C-alpha cells in the first residue's frame, strides 16, 4: 500500500488541499480539520484493562501459596462439617483470614505499581514534540498533535518530520530514512520528480524521520495512522544485585520453612497446622515488596530530578547519573548565560568602555569622529537582526531581539549609543549580503553610501580579528586612512590579547570604499565571480562583548571539584578566551597553571617546561586532529583540568572515547546533530531542552529543561542518593524477619508457651511491608553527599555482610526482644510469672490437663490458658508493628502499666542507639542504629 501525491504538480496542490503554498490554510480551517480529521499520528497503541493486572497482582508471586493454604483450610472445615456435627468454626476463620491477607497484600502491591506508573508517564508531556508551521502568515510553533492535513510545515536541520510531507521548496535538505529503510545514509529531498515509487521519490518526507541538514517546506498529505510508518506495526547492575539477593533470601526462606515445618511436626502439630506454619514462614521471609520498593525509589528520585530541571528519559539513566565521573560540557548556553552584552571597544588605540546605559550615554567618549561613526555604521548595517513589532515602548535594555545573541548585543549597544538603528539602516540602502557560515569567517555586504561618495558598492564586513586583519590591509586612525605598519599590528594584537584575556568575545570590523572606475554604478555582483575586492580593506576598530557565566555555574563547578568529578570544557572558541572563561568559572582554578603560564612565569621558553609541572591544559582543536590514541590518553590522564578550545563537535566523540578508556562514567552535552554519536557513545548523554534539536533529544538519556550546567550537577547529586536509600530500604524490609522466627525458636528451646502464631506472623508481615515505601516517600537529603569520591560501578555492591548483619542481628534482635517483653508482661499480669513459664510448654499445650497452676496457686482450664495465649499473640503482633512504624517517624525526626507496649521496645531501640553512638565503630554502619 503506497499511494502518494508525488505525481501531482504545485498548481493543483492548491486545489486538492485548498491551502496557499506561501500562506498555508488559516487557523479556523486548521481547527475545523482537527475537529473533523482528528489528532496527529498518535500511533494508537494497545493496552491492558488493568483488571488483568490486578488479578495478576492478587494471584501472582508467592500469594499462590497463601491461596493454597486458604483452600486447604476451607476444605478441612468442609470435611469436618460434613463428617461430624457441631463443627468448631476455626479452619473456616483461618481460611478467611488467609484470603483477607492475600487480598490486602495484592491491594498494596497494585497501589504501589499504579503510583509508580502514574508518577512515570508524566515525563511524556514535559517536552512535547513541536512542529514548525506557518499558518496565518507567521511561522508559529503549534504542538505536533495539532498538525492537520494540508497546512505547510517547515523542517530544519535536526527536526523530526511531524507528518507525511510532499516538500514544495528545499534548501539542501537531507533526511535520515533509517527508521523506514535499513541504511542511515542521509538521502536528499527536492521538490522534483524522481522514481515513481513513493519510498524513493526524493520528494516525500516520511513521518518519524529526521532532517539531518538543510531546510525544507512541504504540504502535509497523511496525518494519523494513515502514515507510512503508522500502517506498519537488558539488565542494570542495581537490578542484577537486587535479583541475586532476592533469590538468595528466597532460598534461605524456603530452607527455614522446611526446617520449621519438620520441627513443628516433631512437636505434635496437626497436619493443617504444620502445612500452614510452613506457608506462613515462607511467605513472611521472602522479600516480595522489594522490586516495587526499588522501583518506587527510582521513580521518586526521577520525579525529584525533573523538578530540578533534569528530565531523565529512562530509569536506567537515573542509576547511571549518580555514578558519573566526567561531565565533558560545552560553553555557550551551558556554562555561560548566552546573553551577551557589549562591554569594550578598541578604536583610536584607546580601549574604550561600552558601559553607556541611561547615565552618561557617552561613557569615555560622546561622539568622537568618523572613527566611531564608521564603527557604528558597520555594526548597524552588517547585522541581520531586527526588533520584533509591538516592542517600541519598553526600554532598550529590556527589549527583545530576533537572531543571534551576538547580533542582538551589537544592535542593543549601538542603538543605545546612536539612535533608531531602524532609521539608520533604512536611510542607507542594503542590497547584497552573503550568508553567515563558519567557512569564510566574514559577513560581506554590498552597500551604497548616500552622503558624499555614492560608489554604489561598499565592503562592510565583520569577522574574527585574527583573520579580518589579514585582508583589511589599511587601517583608519582619527578618521584618516593610514597604512598598517608592524607597530599598529602589534598594538592590535595587544588589544586582542587584553580584551580576550577578560573572557570576552572579540569581533573585527574593516571596510573600504571601492573605486568607481573598476566597478561602475551598474554592476551585477555574483558570489561565484570575484567581483568585489574581498581583500585590501581598512581597519576601523574592535568590539568586545561579555558572555557572563550562569549564576549557579561556579558553585556547581566547586561541587564537582569537591565530589571528585572531572569537568572538561569543549568549546569552539579562541584558546585565550576559553582559558579566561574557564578560569572565571572554575574549570582551571587557582594555583594550577598551563605550560604556557609556567613558561611566562619562569621567563623560560615553552619547550623546556616540563609537562608534568602543569596540572591545567588547553588543547587546540586542530591539534587534537593529530594526536593518536596514546597522546590523547596521556593528555586526559596527566592533566586534571582540561579545556578543549577550537574543538569541532565531531571531535566530542574522540574526547568521550578517550575519557571512557580510563573506566570513567562520562556525561556529555548535546544541542546538535553532529553531537548525536557522542550522546550515544557516552554513558549518560545529556541533551538541551530549549536550545537543543529533536535529534539530540532523541539520542540522549537526559534532558536539561533550563540548559544550565548546574542542573547536571544537581542531577548527579540527586542520583547519588539512591545508592544509600536502597540499602536503607533493604534493611527495613529485612529487619522484620527475626521477630517472626525467634518466637518459635525460643518456644522450642526454652519450652515456653508460643509467643506468636502463624496467622499472627502473617499479620506482622502484612502490617510492616509498607515501611520501606513510606520511608522513601518521606526522606530528607543527606549532607556531605557531594563530598565523597564517585562510586565504583563494578566494585561496589548494595548488599554486604555489614548490611545483612545490621538488619538481621541487631535491629531484628531488638524488635524481637521488645515483642518478647510484651508477651512476658501480659503473661505475668495474669498470674504466670516469667520464671514459672520455663518448661510449661508441654502442659500448656495439653488439651486434657485442665489444672495448670499459676505462680499464685490458681488453676486454669485449657481454654482459659488459650485465651491468654491468643491475647499474647495479638499483643506481640501489635507491639512489633507499632514499634516498626513509630521508630520510622522518630528516626526521620531525630536524625497504668501497659507501658509494656510500644513504649518499651522504642525505649530499648533508643538506648541501643545511644550505645552504638558511643561506640563509633568503623565506614560507619551506625546510621542504621
Amino acid at each position: 500500500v503506497s499511494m502518494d501525491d508525488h505525481k501531482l504538480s504545485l498548481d493543483e496542490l492548491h486545489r486538492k488541499y485548498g491551502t496557499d503554498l506561501s500562506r498555508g490554510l488559516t487557523s479556523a480551517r486548521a481547527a475545523e480539520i482537527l475537529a473533523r480529521d482528528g489528532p496527529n499520528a498518535l500511533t494508537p497503541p494497545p493496552t491492558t484493562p488493568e483488571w488483568i493486572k490486578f488479578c495478576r497482582q492478587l494471584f501472582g508471586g508467592f500469594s499462590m501459596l497463601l491461596w493454597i493454604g486458604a483452600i486447604l483450610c476451607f476444605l478441612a472445615y468442609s470435611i469436618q462439617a460434613a463428617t461430624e456435627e457441631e463443627p468448631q468454626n476455626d479452619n473456616l476463620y483461618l481460611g478467611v483470614v488467609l484470603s483477607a491477607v492475600v487480598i490486602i497484600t495484592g491491594c498494596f502491591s497494585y497501589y504501589q505499581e499504579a503510583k509508580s506508573s502514574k508518577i512515570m508517564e508524566s515525563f511524556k508531556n514535559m517536552v512535547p514534540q513541536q512542529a514548525l508551521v506557518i499558518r496565518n502568515g507567521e511561522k508559529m510553533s503549534i504542538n505536533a498533535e495539532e498538525v492537520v492535513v494540508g497546512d505547510l510545515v517547515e523542517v530544519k536541520g535536526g527536526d523530526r518530520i511531524p507528518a507525511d510531507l510532499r516538500i514544495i521548496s528545499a534548501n539542501g535538505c537531507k533526511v535520515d530514512n533509517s527508521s523506514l529503510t535499513g541504511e542511515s545514509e542521509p538521502q536528499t529531498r527536492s521538490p522534483d520528480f524522481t522514481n515513481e515509487n513513493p519510498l524513493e521519490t526524493r520528494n516525500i518526507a516520511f513521518f518519524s524521520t529526521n532532517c539531518v541538514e538543510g531546510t525544507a517546506r512541504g504540504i502535509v498529505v497523511y496525518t494519523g495512522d494513515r502514515t507510512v510508518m503508522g500502517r506498519i506495526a537488558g539488565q542494570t547492575p542495581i537490578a542484577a544485585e537486587i535479583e541475586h539477593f532476592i533469590h538468595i533470601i528466597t532460598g534461605v526462606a524456603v530452607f527455614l520453612g522446611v526446617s520449621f515445618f519438620i520441627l513443628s511436626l516433631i512437636l505434635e502439630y496437626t497436619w493443617l497446622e504444620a502445612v500452614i506454619f510452613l506457608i506462613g514462614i515462607i511467605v513472611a521471609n521472602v522479600p516480595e515488596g522489594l522490586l516495587a520498593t526499588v522501583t518506587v525509589c527510582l521513580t521518586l528520585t526521577a520525579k525529584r530530578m525533573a523538578r530540578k530541571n533534569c528530565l531523565v528519559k529512562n530509569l536506567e539513566a537515573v542509576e547511571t547519573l549518580g555514578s558519573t565521573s566526567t561531565i565533558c560540557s560545552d560553553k555557550t548556553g551551558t556554562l555561560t548565560q548566552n546573553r551577551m552584552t557589549v562591554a569594550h571597544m578598541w578604536f583610536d588605540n584607546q580601549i574604550h568602555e561600552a558601559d553607556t546605559t541611561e547615565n552618561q550615554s557617552g561613557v569615555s567618549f560622546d561622539k568622537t569622529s568618523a572613527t566611531w561613526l564608521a564603527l557604528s555604521r558597520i555594526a548597524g548595517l552588517c547585522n541581520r537582526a531586527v526588533f520584533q513589532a509591538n516592542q517600541e515602548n519598553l526600554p532598550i535594555l529590556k527589549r527583545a531581539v530576533a537572531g543571534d545573541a551576538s547580533e542582538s548585543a551589537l544592535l542593543k549597544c549601538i542603538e543605545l549609543c546612536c539612535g533608531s538603528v531602524k532609521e539608520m539602516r533604512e536611510r542607507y540602502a542594503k542590497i547584497v549580503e552573503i550568508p553567515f557560515n563558519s567557512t569564510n569567517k566574514y559577513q560581506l555586504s554590498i552597500h551604497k553610501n548616500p552622503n558624499t561618495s555614492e560608489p554604489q558598492h561598499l565592503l562592510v564586513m565583520k569577522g574574527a580579528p585574527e583573520r579580518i586583519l589579514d585582508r583589511c590591509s589599511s587601517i583608519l586612525l582619527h578618521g584618516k586612512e593610514q597604512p598598517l605598519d608592524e607597530e599598529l599590528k602589534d598594538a592590535f594584537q595587544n588589544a586582542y590579547l587584553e580584551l580576550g584575556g577578560l573572557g570576552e568575545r572579540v569581533l573585527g570590523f574593516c571596510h573600504l570604499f571601492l573605486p568607481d572606475e573598476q566597478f561602475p554604478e551598474g554592476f551585477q555582483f555574483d558570489t561565484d565571480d570575484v567581483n568585489f575586492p574581498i581583500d585590501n580593506l581598512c581597519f576601523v576598530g574592535l568590539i568586545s562583548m561579555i558572555d557572563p557565566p550562569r549564576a549557579a555555574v561556579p558553585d556547581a563547578v566547586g561541587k564537582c571539584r569537591s565530589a571528585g568529578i572531572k569537568v572538561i570544557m569543549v568549546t569552539g572558541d579562541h584558546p585565550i578566551t576559553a582559558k579566561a572563561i574557564a578560569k572565571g568559572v572554575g574549570i582551571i582554578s587557582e594555583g594550577n597553571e598551563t605550560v604556557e603560564d609556567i613558561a611566562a612565569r619562569l621567563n623560560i621558553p615553552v619547550s623546556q617546561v616540563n609537562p608534568r609541572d602543569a596540572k591545567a591544559c588547553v588543547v587546540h582543536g586542530s591539534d587534537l586532529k593529530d594526536m593518536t590514541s596514546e597522546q590523547l590518553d596521556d593528555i586526559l590522564k596527566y592533566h586534571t583540568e582540561i579545556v578543549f578550545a577550537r574543538t569541532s563537535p565531531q571531535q566530542k566523540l574522540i574526547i568521550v572515547e578517550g575519557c571512557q578508556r580510563q573506566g570513567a562514567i562520562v556525561a556529555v552535552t548535546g544541542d546538535g546533530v553532529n553531537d548525536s554519536p557522542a550522546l550515544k557513545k557516552a554513558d549518560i548523554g545529556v541533551a538541551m531542552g530549549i536550545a537543543g534539536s529533536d535529534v539530540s533529544k532523541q539520542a540522549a538519556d537526559m534532558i536539561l529543561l533550563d540548559d544550565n550546567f548546574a542542573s547536571i550537577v544537581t542531577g548527579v547529586e540527586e542520583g547519588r542518593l539512591i545508592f544509600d536509600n536502597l540499602k536503607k530500604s533493604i534493611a527495613y524490609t529485612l529487619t522484620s524477619n527475626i521477630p517472626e522466627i525467634t518466637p518459635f525458636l525460643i518456644f522450642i528451646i526454652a519450652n515456653i508457651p508460643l509467643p506468636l502464631g502463624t496467622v499472627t506472623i502473617l499479620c506482622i508481615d502484612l502490617g510492616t511491608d509498607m515501611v520501606p515505601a513510606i520511608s522513601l516517600a518521606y526522606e530528607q537529603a543527606e549532607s556531605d553527599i557531594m563530598k565523597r569520591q564517585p562510586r565504583n560501578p563494578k566494585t561496589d555492591k548494595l548488599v554486604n555482610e555489614r548490611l545483612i548483619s545490621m538488619a538481621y542481628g541487631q535491629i531484628g534482635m531488638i524488635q524481637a526482644l521488645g515483642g518478647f517483653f510484651t508477651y512476658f508482661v501480659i503473661l505475668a499480669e495474669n498470674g504466670f510469672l516469667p520464671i514459672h513459664l520455663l518448661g510449661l510448654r508441654v502442659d500448656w499445650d495439653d488439651r486434657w490437663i485442665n489444672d495448670v497452676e499459676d505462680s499464685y496457686g490458681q488453676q486454669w482450664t485449657y481454654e482459659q490458658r488459650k485465651i491468654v495465649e491468643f491475647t499474647c499473640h495479638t499483643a506481640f503482633f501489635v507491639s512489633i508493628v507499632v514499634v516498626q512504624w513509630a521508630d520510622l517517624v522518630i528516626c526521620k525526626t531525630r536524625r497504668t502499666w501497659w507501658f509494656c507496649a510500644f513504649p518499651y521496645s522504642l525505649l530499648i531501640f533508643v538506648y541501643d542507639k545511644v550505645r552504638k553512638l558511643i561506640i563509633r565503630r568503623r565506614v560507619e554502619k551506625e546510621t542504621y542504629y
Binding site: L397, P548, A551, A552, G689, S783
Partner: protein, 296 residues
C-alpha cells in the same frame, strides 16, 4: 542614607535608601524575613568587599516590614491587618513616593513571598528577583499541625530559629546561632513581631505554574529569577517546589554548598558572585569583569 518612612493604606512602612538613583536604573529593593530587620541580615551582606562594586553602580532601598523597624511602638491589640497580598500592596506607593521606576528584588523568606506577590501583581515594575528561601505554599496539613502542637509550648524566638536554621546547626548551636538570637530577641518589638509571624503563617498559596505550551495556564514571574537556598536549610523542599511551577528559561536554582539557614550572611562571597552574574546576564554592569578571573 535617607530614612523616609512613607505611610500608606494599612500602615507606615519605613525605608532606608542607601544610595542615589542613577537616573532610571533599577534600584535594589530589599525585604527581610521574619524575626529580623534589614540591619541584621542585609547590612552584613551589602557591606561585603565584593558587594561594593555592585552597589556603586546601583542604589539600595532597604525596606522594613511595618512594626519591625528599629525603635517602634506597639498596640494593645495590634490586629496587624496587612496580609501577604496586602503587604505586597503598599510597595507601589513606596516606589512612587521615592520617585522609583523599576526594582530588583532581594527576598528572604517572608520578604521573598512579598516580592513574588508584588511581581505577580504588577510585572512591569519588577525587573528581576533573587528570592532567597522562598516558600510559595501554605503550612499544609501535617506541618500546620506540628506548628500548632509544638509552637504553643515553645518560645516565639525559638520557633524563629527553627524556621531559619537547620536542625543540625540548631542542635550544634554554634557561634552564629547565638550571635543571631541576640539580635532576634532584642533589636525588635516582640508585640509586633508575633503579629507579623502570625500573618506569615496566615498565607494563601501563591498562584504560579510552569508554562506547558497548552492559554489557560496560570500566570508566572516573567522577570528573570535566581532562587538561592543553602544545601543545609529547612526551606530546601520549599524552594525546589518553587523552582518547579516556574519558567525554566528565566529562573535559576542556586543550591548553595556548605551553607544553610542564611546564605546572605554565611557565604556572602558566593552569593555576591551569583548576584553579579545574574545582573550581568540581565545587561547591567557589563564591565565588572569576573571574580575568579579578577585576581590575575
Amino acid at each position: 542614607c535617607q530614612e523616609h518612612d512613607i505611610e500608606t493604606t494599612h500602615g507606615v512602612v519605613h525605608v532606608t535608601i542607601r544610595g542615589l538613583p542613577k537616573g532610571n536604573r533599577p534600584v535594589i529593593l530589599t525585604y527581610h524575613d521574619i524575626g529580623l530587620n534589614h540591619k541584621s541580615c542585609f547590612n552584613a551582606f551589602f557591606n561585603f568587599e565584593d558587594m561594593q562594586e555592585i552597589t556603586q553602580h546601583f542604589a539600595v532601598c532597604h525596606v522594613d516590614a511595618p512594626g519591625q523597624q528599629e525603635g517602634a511602638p506597639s498596640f494593645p491589640t495590634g490586629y496587624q491587618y496587612p496580609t501577604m497580598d496586602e503587604l505586597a500592596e503598599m510597595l507601589p506607593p513606596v516606589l512612587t513616593h521615592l520617585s522609583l521606576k523599576s526594582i530588583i528584588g532581594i527576598g528572604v523568606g517572608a520578604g521573598a513571598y512579598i516580592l513574588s506577590r508584588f511581581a505577580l501583581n504588577h510585572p512591569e515594575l519588577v525587573e528581576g528577583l533573587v528570592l532567597i528561601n522562598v516558600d510559595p505554599c501554605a503550612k499544609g496539613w501535617i506541618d500546620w499541625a506540628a506548628s500548632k502542637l509544638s509552637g504553643l509550648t515553645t518560645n516565639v524566638v525559638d520557633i524563629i530559629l527553627a524556621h531559619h536554621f537547620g536542625q543540625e546547626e540548631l542542635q550544634a548551636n554554634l557561634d552564629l546561632i547565638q550571635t543571631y538570637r541576640m539580635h532576634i530577641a532584642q533589636d525588635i518589638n516582640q508585640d509586633n513581631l508575633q503579629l507579623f509571624l502570625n500573618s506569615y503563617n496566615g498565607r494563601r498559596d501563591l498562584e504560579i505554574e510552569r508554562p506547558i505550551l497548552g492559554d489557560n495556564k496560570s500566570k508566572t514571574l516573567k522577570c528573570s529569577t535566581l532562587l538561592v537556598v543553602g544545601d543545609n536549610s529547612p526551606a530546601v523542599e520549599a524552594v525546589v517546589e518553587c523552582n518547579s511551577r516556574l519558567n525554566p528559561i528565566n529562573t535559576t536554582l542556586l543550591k548553595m554548598a556548605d551553607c544553610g539557614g542564611l546564605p546572605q550572611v554565611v557565604q556572602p562571597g558566593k552569593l555576591t558572585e551569583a548576584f553579579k552574574y545574574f545582573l550581568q546576564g540581565m545587561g547591567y554592569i557589563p564591565s565588572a569583569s569576573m571574580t575568579r578571573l579578577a585576581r590575575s
